[PDB]
Amino acid sequence: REKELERAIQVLCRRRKNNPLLVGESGVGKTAIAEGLAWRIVQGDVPEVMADCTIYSLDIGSLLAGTKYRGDFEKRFKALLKQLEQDTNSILFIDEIHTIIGAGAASGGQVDAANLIKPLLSSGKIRVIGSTTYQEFSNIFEKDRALARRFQKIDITEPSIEETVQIINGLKPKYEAHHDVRYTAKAVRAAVELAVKYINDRHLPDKAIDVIDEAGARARLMPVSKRKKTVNVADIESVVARIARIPEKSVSQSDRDTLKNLGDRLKMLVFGQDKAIEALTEAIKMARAGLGHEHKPVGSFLFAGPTGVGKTEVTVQLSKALGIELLRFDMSEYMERHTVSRLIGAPPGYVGFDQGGLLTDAVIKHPHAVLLLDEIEKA
Amino acid sequence: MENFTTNLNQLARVGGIDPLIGREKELERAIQVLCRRRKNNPLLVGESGVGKTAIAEGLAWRIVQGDVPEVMADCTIYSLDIGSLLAGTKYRGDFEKRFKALLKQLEQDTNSILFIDEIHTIIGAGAASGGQVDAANLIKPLLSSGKIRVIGSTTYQEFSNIFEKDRALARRFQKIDITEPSIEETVQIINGLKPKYEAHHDVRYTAKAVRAAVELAVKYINDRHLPDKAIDVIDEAGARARLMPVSKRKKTVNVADIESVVARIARIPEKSVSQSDRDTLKNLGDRLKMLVFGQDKAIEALTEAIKMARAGLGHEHKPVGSFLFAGPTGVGKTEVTVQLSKALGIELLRFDMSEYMERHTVSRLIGAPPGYVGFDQGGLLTDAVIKHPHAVLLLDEIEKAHPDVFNILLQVMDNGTLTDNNGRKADFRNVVLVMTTNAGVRETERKSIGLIHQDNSTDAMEEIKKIFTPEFRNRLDNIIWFDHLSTDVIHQVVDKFIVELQVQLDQKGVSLEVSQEARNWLAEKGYDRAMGARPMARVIQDNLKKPLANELLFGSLVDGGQVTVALDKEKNELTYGF
Amino acid sequence: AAVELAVKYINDRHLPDKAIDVIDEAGARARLMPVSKRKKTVNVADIESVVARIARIPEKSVSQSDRDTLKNLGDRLKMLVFGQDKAIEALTEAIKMARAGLGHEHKPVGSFLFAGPTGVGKTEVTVQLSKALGIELLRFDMSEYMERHTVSRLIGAPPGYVGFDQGGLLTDAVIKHPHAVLLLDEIEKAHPDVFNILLQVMDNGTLTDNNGRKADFRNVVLVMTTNAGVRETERKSIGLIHQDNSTDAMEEIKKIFTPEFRNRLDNIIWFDHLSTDVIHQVVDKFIVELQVQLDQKGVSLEVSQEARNWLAEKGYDRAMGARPMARVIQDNLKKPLANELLFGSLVDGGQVTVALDKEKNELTYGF
Ligand SMILES: Nc1ncnc2c1ncn2[C@@H]1O[C@H](COP(=O)(O)OP(=O)(O)OP(=O)(O)O)[C@@H](O)[C@H]1O
Ligand SMILES: Nc1ncnc2c1ncn2[C@@H]1O[C@H](COP(=O)(O)OP(=O)(O)OP(=O)(O)O)[C@@H](O)[C@H]1O
Ligand SMILES: Nc1ncnc2c1ncn2[C@@H]1O[C@H](COP(=O)(O)OP(=O)(O)OP(=O)(O)O)[C@@H](O)[C@H]1O
């Protein structure tokens, strides 16, 4: 994070409005950027002007505690700004800065943490570092434009894969000290890559750390006979597949047989129509071996023929045999050009907005499942 | 006035107030309002950072400088600090006592002026659950009598939503609209402010530097107003330049420095081309032509649009490029765009426009209006572009969306802006807009009747013209019609797919080699011009992946080695090994 | 005159306070007017000046440079939008009438429906008008108002709902800049329920948002640009004679907008296609813009007149207006210049020349 810290220090040296606002997605490490700037200050690995200044992390609860008797909060805050003004070598850090947009009385929503710092930030006597997410920044913060213009927004993007690997290698000492385990560098690279591949609803510099911490916590629970061991690609892969629902390594366990005798086991329940079972089993076996499509479903099959010859039967038996939740969607309920609103949800502002989609929520809840669309020609 | 106000004339005498430049009309109006008999209370309103507080403080500054008509002299101005005044008023009656004491001091002075910055803040001081005597009411009688003179300052939104909601207090103040300066006026303002920033940063600004800063802040920074973002760029460049002398890269502030600072603030690329970024574009067409075979004119168009954008001579307020890749299935329309996003290391914004089949789905793109359930969410398109101002926007199968949704892209392609339900303008000047379709293909896959077979080459263009409105097609940068894949293209494609399979294998510690006759046989088996390059990957799948997956999942190839594929001549089958 | 002006120009305050404020401020001004010891009686002109200062409206400025601005406004615009003279004339005459006092009593300065084929200076002349007049341009891309309930965005959300404190976009934009140019781009794309707002905006010059504020349109030049019937204008009719589809597009205009809406439009100016000389002028304008872009990089440029004729003949397409000319200028100059400028001879130095060869129909270049 050389460029982000460099731009933050450039902003902090401005004559007026020297208030960097670190805004990025959730889990990118803006709080980490601020705390690491402090940690660099204590180590002297900072530009000359940025030496000899101490960063204070301001907590709203501790300040807003007990402040009845109108005036108590205003007095507390004015005293805080006073003590901060006399330093010229102190930087105030507010972790969730979108939350200082109100502390005033409910009687008249008025002078609060916002309307009390505007003259101070505009006059450039004190310096504040902020941090917020995009969702809060664009909904709560930049509504007091006079407050938003006093902060210089700094985009904190999520690091790359190898940058994340270097971050994990820098953070490895503390996690190893906490869990009393060791992580191999190859296991770290595998953790970052698998977090990129499978953990889709969290951002990069955090989900890899999550995988590391969970692998360490679990490896501290394996030693039921004191089997402390270093975390390799295998255990971390299993921890990732806990969210991905399918381990790529573990197939060599008591599951290679299930794919081995899947076709014969299904032919024990669906007689005739052998090539359909062949195709389904071969697709599942390819996806399990790792020759699958990196951006496509395990399979996309069209089953045709006269009715009642086992088109749905083979699918339900497959879902049973693989222990996989069958997701059935009858395309007889979708004979209109406007029913897809129940598949994906209604646009914002409409009656069914907060209800969500059927197909999307089903797939999100069951990442590993079978999708069945009966009578696709009916839809 | 002891510990609740700040004597602005004292602060101006110690040089703590920046010099007021221009603003002669507004200052004259403020003086005229101040010299009224009753209700002589000017209210400065305007957008954020246009100079309201600046004008109010420059009034006292000029009073100290003597550049005032001989009626406002000796009138020392006090700025009110509401927090300091409300700090210790813990007990009832105390706030009213100190406020009345301040008002008595001001009234008996008969000469001072109270400048209440953020004057929208005094509509609440009371605590006894109602419409108590609080400062708003405590000053209402005096303004109507003109015994004291008060100057306010509040933004347009604050004034319109909070201040003027109290009609009785509002009618006691005279509104003075502080409009944002022009380019020349803000140039003069920066020229007048130059000594302070130059002494602060120990740098010198060239005149060309100031002019370029103002022009670039006008062009790129579109969320702030003039006299606040130009000096923002200037102060930022000064702070950046002052961090160089520690590395002894000390100089004056040249235009290139201002451009770098602006590119940083607006999060856009300006002059990185001076570095190893010219080579990035130089071999860009080559780097794509080895990932997407055939369809070369598309790579030419994309590369040339990006080159015109990075060189500087692109469009002024239009997207970097707005193309309509039309062609049959599986010819690389989505793939070339994905590889373009990958090559530039720039974020890809993917929008499968088949989920927008209904006219009312536009609320997903630009948000729901005020008063409706999804208001706090905002549009997907606009928020995506605001987060990533430099990106590639890909609209897959745009022909599948409801034809009314293209009117959204109308203004995106023409003016490069798009406003969501909060009034935010998504900036599309650094977005490579690509829309893919197979619109006119079905008409070209037509069998003519008669003795003479007729050329159907123009049917694709006819159908595209019949689908997209003329005012929409009129603003497309180019409509790159894609051709089918030929035999040699199929060879290159099966080679690409074999390389991808070889990487997938290397992931598992296995190696593969395929004979040349085996590659040609794979190319011959699954080649189909009507289906593009997907059936070739399908044939590679059912021919190599299945037997290889059986060898890998069971025994032989667990930690396997060099797998060799060879073609037979007696039967034309494939051989395998370990 | 003070009482009457405070009545009909100041509609946010009540009567026996705004007349008093006019009088008091005029007295204070005449008291500060002795910058040459000049104190006199307050006449009607001083009252009108104070009122125009308060209500934020243009005053009687015939003694100003504004007289000269309005004088050459038509000729100045005609040098930025070539052809389409009748629209520039209607705009300039409406603005002049509004300035001379012979405006409408309670109507916007003008409410014009700019229709016509594509690629012609329809939405462009409005921007150039806002630039020449130096007044703020309020641009509203009406293609985002396809949903019938987006009126809540124009005038705000009613009391009791989430978007209340945000207000309406159009009303707030007007209240901020009462003297402006309102560009409702692509007006035909909005849901028909949106035209009903412009109904009262055009007939009565006012608009009430959710907070009960009155948006005053009496100084706003309302301009709406449309493409109604453009699909018809580009269609070649069946028969030996190809017809003029202009009146067809007018009938489409009539079928889109209700009669009570078309009845209060000051004029429906049907823009016409661009001719060849107009295309030559357009090429010249684009070349000037490109030269400005290049001089921003320290690169000069000159093009032989024959090469400009070649570009015009290459790009001319009446059915598509002046937009394909930008694409042709791009394809023929911007790409070679870009390849020379990024990695080529043109780094940090220009003096590029262009000319047409007659045998090969190509262009020349070089340092
Ligand atoms: N640049 C970095 N270097 C080292 N470690 C890092 C970096 N970024 C993040 N981390 C670590 O990854 C985790 C996530 O980062 P961080 O906590 O700082 O962001 P955040 O405060 O959660 O942001 P937000 O408040 O928007 O959710 C942290 O535990 C942090 O230690
Ligand atoms: N090849 C088969 N093997 C085993 N059982 C079978 C076979 N064919 C049919 N059946 C029986 O027929 C019943 C219904 O079959 P199924 O639900 O799959 O209909 P289908 O093939 O999907 O055709 P459709 O739904 O269009 O009428 C099953 O309960 C099953 O017992
Ligand atoms: N008339 C002017 N001449 C020179 N410089 C100016 C003028 N106005 C403003 N500035 C500069 O622009 C900066 C911000 O403008 P200004 O302080 O006047 O508005 P503001 O009071 O901060 O508005 P708000 O509080 O609503 O954001 C000031 O710090 C000042 O240095």
Ligand SMILES: Nc1ncnc2c1ncn2[C@@H]1O[C@H](COP(=O)(O)OP(=O)(O)OP(=O)(O)O)[C@@H](O)[C@H]1O
């Ligand atoms: N010209 C090509 N050269 C090499 N490989 C290719 C080409 N086109 C496609 N492919 C491959 O075939 C697959 C499909 O490509 P792509 O999706 O970009 O085609 P498309 O034009 O978008 O088809 P559609 O009309 O359905 O949108 C990709 O995996 C891609 O790698």
Ligand SMILES: Nc1ncnc2c1ncn2[C@@H]1O[C@H](COP(=O)(O)OP(=O)(O)OP(=O)(O)O)[C@@H](O)[C@H]1O
């Ligand atoms: N009569 C003209 N003279 C010179 N230049 C012109 C003329 N018309 C258009 N142009 C140029 O061509 C471009 C398009 O012009 P404009 O946007 O005004 O047409 P339009 O009517 O708004 O198109 P549409 O009907 O699709 O909305 C502009 O950049 C403009 O500079």
